[PDB]
Design a protein around this ligand. Structure first.
Ligand SMILES: [Ca+2]
Length: 181
């Protein structure tokens, strides 16, 4: 059973981190996405200088991460055809301390490091999936559009926690809320 959610441009999931803050020196994020749109927020967590932002930005997969001492921005461009071709594309983001790697469809990979010395991502805000109350204003966001398309199997995990966000949205949770205009 996969857990697939459809977004139409005015919707998002919102997982409440206030009582179980993210405090992570190494993370992984996986999902698959399907869309016809060039721009859209896939996922975000964090405020101020600690954040992770994942989005399609003019057809490329865009990831911006900051651990509090300066952001890294990774773009993955398509090679043959397009990511917004309404076929499923798998995303994987792996971070160990400051080392960041994102791969799309296994093969297409951009790797780098967040700036300077900070290794810890802190977030007691919300984990957003598919959009947010005001996407343009999210730290590190290159887009203002919520997602319009499908997202499945969204998982954030570190050594302490595993957040099966797509499963939680589908199955229900006290900390999980679905918003639609
Ligand atoms: Ca930090």
């Amino acid at each position: 059973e996969e857990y697939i959610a459809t977004f139409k441009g005015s919707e998002y999931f919102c997982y409440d981190l206030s009582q179980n803050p993210i405090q992570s020196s190494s993370d992984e994020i996986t999902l698959s996405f399907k869309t016809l749109q060039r721009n859209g927020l896939m996922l975000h967590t964090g405020k101020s200088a600690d954040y992770v932002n994942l989005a399609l930005k003019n057809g490329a997969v865009s990831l911006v991460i900051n651990l509090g001492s300066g952001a890294f921005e990774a773009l993955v461009e398509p090679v043959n055809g397009k990511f917004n071709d309404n076929a499923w594309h798998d995303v994987k983001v792996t971070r160990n301390l400051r080392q960041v790697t994102i791969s799309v469809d296994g093969i297409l990979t951009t790797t780098g490091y967040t700036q300077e010395d900070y290794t810890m991502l802190g977030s007691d805000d919300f984990f957003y999936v598919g959009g947010s109350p005001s996407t343009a204003d999210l730290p590190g966001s290159p887009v203002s559009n919520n997602f319009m398309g499908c997202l499945k199997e969204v998982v954030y995990k570190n050594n302490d926690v595993r957040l099966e966000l797509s499963r939680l949205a589908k199955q229900g949770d006290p900390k999980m809320k679905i918003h639609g205009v």
